[model samples]
Target: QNSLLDLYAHPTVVARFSEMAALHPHREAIRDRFGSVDYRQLLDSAEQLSDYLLEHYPQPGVCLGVYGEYSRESITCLLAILLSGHHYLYIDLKQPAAWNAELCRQVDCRLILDCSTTPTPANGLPCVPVRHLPAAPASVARPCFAADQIAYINFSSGTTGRPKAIACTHAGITRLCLGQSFLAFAPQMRFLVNSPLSFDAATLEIWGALLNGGCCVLNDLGPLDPGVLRQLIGERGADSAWLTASLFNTLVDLDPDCLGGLRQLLTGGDILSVPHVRRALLRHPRLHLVNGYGPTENTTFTCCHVVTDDDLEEDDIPIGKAIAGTAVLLLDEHGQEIAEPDRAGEIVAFGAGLAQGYRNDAARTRASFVELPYRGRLLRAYRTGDRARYDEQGRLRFIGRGDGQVKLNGYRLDLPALEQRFRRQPGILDCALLVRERNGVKQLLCAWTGKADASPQALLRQLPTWQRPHACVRVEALPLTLDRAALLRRLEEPL
Candidate 1:
């Protein structure tokens, strides 16, 4: 099997930073809620954190959990973790306590660098406060990180009980950052970090600046606050930013001049509706709007399509083409290749950028990542489990998930995982959960029949927004298939 190094000749992320710091040591590398850190200062801070980790918490191959909100300190700590030749797991501060505790237990986190004072369940794990960690002076020599060495781990859902961690190496991150830079970033560009760090879409916003010597202004805004977003963008002089389709729609609805300084606007996460694209184009004709597509298993983005006013008029915007050094294959159910244009099939991706399967789930890894037949090599392609079809222009168009997984707002969710929540509820014999769209907006619906009655809103209060069903319908009995499996059909007409 070819190693990740064999695929990408040289690592580019750390190399780019070395080059930038050499040219402009005092240039600003990151800006966040706390303060700004120049390239020289950033390097020194990372080195200090690296030294601390090496001396106190040295686990070469194990994953270190980094629990912190978006800040200059957390960014420095993440770089230090990577520099020490170990991957770090991101624990979102906003996650439910139960979910966070379960993740800690599953990943076997060596140590957590907690930046916030929010009390967590006593897990008996050591946590180093970010504020207390001192910065080390910048060394003339740059630390060496191998191309194939694990860089970071982003958590996604597992078929099993706990969430799975996707292993990304320096090589993969480098290529992804460079590809995004070419597609979006410009010199001295400022971007916004609005998405939660847990989501892969935030990678383009986070690393895009770290690698390119650009600026990332972090903002914690609710989806409904377009006015605040507009003010932040204009005040920060942000030239580039990334948004989910929902966030994009909200911004357009606000119709603020905050986007006047913006040069590139990247949107992804869920499907981008035609009307949303059309509105954006009509509002900001000069802005470069890009629709990026990729699964978490693939570093952040694998394909991109630059949207224009004319492209929105078509039936749907094509998913565009593959990223540099990555190959996208649309395959049939039997693992055979499909060649006909406009033919729908499974979307599989293979390249150096592909992650090292789910952490601690060998069965899932084997099932998702398989050896390709026609590729003529031992290249592994991840079965995205998404249904898509190629257009006459060779652009891939997304249909939906082949499985019960669905994306709500911008967060990817496994319906079975949500069903597990329902199963635990008392008095529910069996429940059926399915997602339905209302007037182009996706909403989840659940139908359950049991001896005991449970209000959907009450059940929702017990679960996270990601797991809660948007609409609930209680029936005396659930529809079943001839084979005895529960049949959960989509409501064709609106309720």
Candidate 2:
């Protein structure tokens, strides 16, 4: 069997960054609204910040918080965390103070490096602003990608009504882009880091570029509009892009022409719209559209499909084949593997890219991450909670949830499938079919951010009585979690 080029050697991301700095010191490394920083400047800036972190923390393996926007400092600080031999806790400033404080508490982070406009982190943890931060007097040492060393702890939505901080090691993250064949990264490739740092896609956009000797162009579109993205990707000449499927659909609606120049465009979080893909492929025939599929527990994407006009003959897009060194197995309720195609079963993904497990939540970790027998080998697998089947051609077709847990009026519901049908409705922009429950009464809260009137009458007619939404809300836009998990979580007080 053939394999990927395997871009990484030293294990840690910045170890390779150090290599690139020496080889192409003058090559542009990162660019944003502020200006461009060559690899030499980027290395110096990161080392300085790492030095500052070392003076304060002194101890190794501390999880320091990196709180800020998509600025140069934010990226530098993250790199510094690695350089200092510790994990970086991403605190999205847009989140409430209490939320961020709790994140620090969970990780036991004492010092947080603040790169955002907010000068102080009122959460009791000492927040040191990036500018005020003092640099290490000497050069800092490179990072080690130890299997036990924690890289980043990302807080994701949990079924238990609390955010689950998922711990991913350096090895796990390194395998995502460098060890995988889903996308090729080179020194000349310039990736548009448009997704929020809170999201997993940012992992691909940032490290996928920086670690591979490529450029990370911070998005110029402050508030994303398809038209603005068109300008960035088209005229601005972004070589790569990663978008959520919902946002990708809107881009196709507004202008598929904008996507004509991108080398690779990966989309996921929701099932892809084949209609939109069909249109985008025609507009940019050279464009490689990848339908990325993976649970947050698994770092970024474990499985992906490189879309083409030939692949769009079906009603929906396939989640695609397993990534390099990853296994996507379909299992029955009793944990038996399904051998035949076209049979629905739970999607189980386990591979080199899978995260260590939930942080400080051993019970939950044990429940989700388990050993399963597949093809004469017992391997660790993460129960994805996703239901899927294979088509005649052996491509994975996402069906619904495994447990069918989301319920409304005692009826098991598939929100991903329902949301897909909602897209056909006119005037509907970004939308979420949220499952809400109060006092034993379960209901559907349909919140949308778009121009179209969320006239569910047309779509609701299509949905059965038990599946109809209890409330329909019209909002300026869907407020998303940094990681883009559970979109409706942004609306705590539903409209």
Candidate 3:
């Protein structure tokens, strides 16, 4: 049980990735629609773009916005933001332009690194075409590591109808990807980087491979396409990928055979189905199927459970112990640590994986991330609203959330925020959004008492696919209580 301080050496992700680029200059670093880009080429582009940014901005720690789909050029821009001593906010193209613009405004973004084919307007911020940046001289010097500097700002929907700006540090990302046991990263490993840029999981998908001397294969296919996955594995030498629990279940149902080629598959961001895990294990006996679990506040992964044949007898999958540079504790309601097994409590994480708190929101940041006096000293811990208890095997088994937040398809949504939005819609007097698991899939069930207006449908169209409910029904009356079982019992019949 060596601490993160004992194992910490790489000061930041940029330093470690630059070292890998120097070591593996000839090796392929990224493969996308355009084609393969070697380590040296990728580093050159990033350096050139970083030099341009430093020359223009000239201010340290300026927040920049990256607006584009996942590609080699976008990766270069993300690295350039780091190399220029600034942090970036990745704006998702799928989200509404207004919301993206508001988010950029909230962060006081000074520049926009536009990597898309079309212009992505963000509150009239200065946009830079990343593809046409001037090349820097070959003799330009690289950047030094700043471990405490904020690396990226990720957004999470809070219950207060405002987005939580989670500021992740350079050491946090480096600690999550470097020297981890969940998955091996080598020159032979072609890790697929497909998660949305806004989602924190992309932090692991991209840096997890690049920082450890592995090629990152950018998946441009927005949705999960099994045919493309098969081609990537067979032709492009992609041997690793991270899928959401919902996506993993769907893939198992649709094309289980296609997943056999992958050497390692990591899935989480929601409760996984035991049946799907068992079926996948039965089919691919040699596959390394890992259950990666964590919150966006803790970089990417806090705990990873490598599923084996022995775990098949269990009723549900256990989110195993913490990874290389993390320590997880179960705390009671009174903020005291829970030591006994089977006593469910909130999961509090401590280590280098913790984020640098929410940006410009001190109250919310203080409420979630707090200091706890443990043993003989104080430890800064992020209270993951998730409830879990230790099993007989000493593994942390997840129970449910202590709050109204629910994770669907790898996206975290505050139920109160969703319900509030529905209430604000016209023709909706009362409403309740419930998560129901029917036949192996978790679906958002919207039950409302309204005059049947088109706003519900209109609102659905505006939201992302994961946030949208699977079915919406106008009911006669809603339930009175907020208890999970009570609401389920009353509305389950109608929904």
Candidate 4:
């Protein structure tokens, strides 16, 4: 009997983190170039910030936009939001200010936590200086919360142009960060926090350290430059880190020694390049390498594979088995679970890591998250729409997406969403968007029919940096075919 689910089902991440803070009060919780904070000091700072939040914006479960660069102050604000029983929507500074503002507006954010060194005016939302928050007395009243309480909000690309809001819960986050064997979470471990704050992967990087009494070494440097990464690990004592598969491959291709300083590394968000994996493993014989996999709906990680020599021979690496307190089922088109070896099916996940569901989008929430009977129990599971197959070793190996979604540059986007965004542009009559491979790189090619006023440059502005199309061709009309198959043929000829 798996009593772990029951064990993890009730306590919120705040409860778990508070317990760790109590146990390791003097232990370092966070370290940046600026300074370091012990667990107790970190907790106290969050308490003070939360007290301020309660006094000003006391609405329970109120969503606030955390707008700033990734830094120790921003992290404190994130913890404070949870401690105050509110929701935080982490805004990525790398994105355009307009895009960030629109997200805040869509989520109905009440306020913005300005953690920027040079603050910019928010999108009409009241901005509170995170660094200038008032301090409270020694004793602070902590709010009570259930595991199911909304901890934060993350956005994922939807079939429609509007982004889907995923309401992540305390239980879902705790389930991913605690009692997991994939990565060791201990006082000795100093995990690097560099993933984009808006990305769900940051949940693992941040909470994975704090909840386990480990120190989070902050990396405020815009992107993960290998030089800065090495400096942090060498000087700041960061021993473990997570990298997207694309970045991992790029780093390895540049020089695998860039990651030699870390004791362990977890990489994934897209398929792992076998050549790079082989090179990395061969160079760093003692390093513990893991392929972390899953969507935002499952918090951060639902499945993780600790890579080994045996996996090197295979052309495709397995995403591995489900992590603790999570259940993975490969179901066929008929909705029957696959049991035979080497059979491909859609991946369905169930357990503590499941998010609360799409906020204010009940239809999509119900469509994706469904109740299924398994092992004499009805489990609420999320259909991942990811195709995978169990290898001879009984590990799940990712195949591809079953739908129009595409994973590029460590970000997943729906093609229809891209098309819809293009369609919404003024003077754009019709739009066809698809992913095309060019010189070993995946490129988004958008072929559209529109007035001359709707130039590619103008239409491209509608998308964020990550979602911009690589190539745009003005078409007289889209060739008649489903999902732009014929349109792709027309676009291919120009290349």
- Against the correct fold, how does model 3 do in TM-score? 0.90
Q: What are the RMSDs of all candidates, in order? A: 4.5, 10.1, 3.4, 3.3
* Residue clash pairs of candidate 2: 427-452
Put down candidate 3 lDDT per residue, 1-495, tens digits, no spaces. 335732244367788888999999989899887789999998888878888887776666889888887888899999989888789887765566666667777787787888898765544556677776775544245445477788999888744667778889888888888777777723366888888778888888888888877888888755556787887777777888998888788788878898867988999888789999998889999888899999988888889999878888888799999987788888898878889889999998888888888886889888888887655668788888889999887899989876778776556788888888998888889888888766446888887887856349888877756678887877777656455566567665743
> Cα lDDT for residue 374, model 2?
57
Query: For candidate 2, lDDT tens digit of each residue in 1-495?
Result: 121212122266665667878998987788877778888998888887777777776666888877777888888988888887888877655455665667777778777778876565455666777777544666444444454467788766435435577887676667776645567633366788877665677888898888777888887557566676766766556788888776787778877776766788888777678888898887778788899988778878878988867787988888888877567789887878888998889999866666778886789999989988756767778888889999887889888764434534322345666775676577886667776545324567777766754575766654434567887777676654422345555565544
lDDT of 3: 0.80
TM-score of 4: 0.90
Candidate scoring better on TM-score of 1 and 3: 3
Of the two candidates 1 and 3, the one with more favorable lDDT, higher being better, is: 3
Task: Order the candidates by lDDT, highest first.
Answer: 4, 3, 2, 1
**TM-score, structure 2 vs. true:** 0.79
lDDT of 1 by residue, 1-495 (tens): 233324455474556666767777887777654567788888777777777776654545557777766677777777777766667887754556566666767667677787665655434555667777655544333345467677777777534335687777676777777644335535676777766667766667877777777777766443425666676676556677887776676667666454666788888777787887787787778888888888888888777888756687787776787776567789887877878787779888888778877775778789888878535665678778777888877888877775767677565677677777776677777777776545435677777766555654656764655666776766666655411234344332344
Q: What is the lDDT of residue 225 in candidate 2?
A: 64
lDDT per prediction? 0.69, 0.72, 0.80, 0.81
Candidate achieving higher TM-score, 2 or 4: 4
Error of 2 at 438 (Å): 25
Candidate 1 ranges beyond 4 A from true positions = 1-7, 10-12, 33-35, 93-98, 117-125, 134-144, 158-161, 179-185, 220-224, 256-258, 374-378, 434-447, 453-465, 468-495
Stretches of candidate 2 off by over 4 Å are: 1-10, 118-123, 139-148, 185-187, 403-495
- Listed in order, each prediction's TM-score against the native is 0.85, 0.79, 0.90, 0.90
Clashes of 2: 1
How many clashes (backbone N, Cα, C below 3 Å) per candidate?
Answer: 0, 1, 0, 0
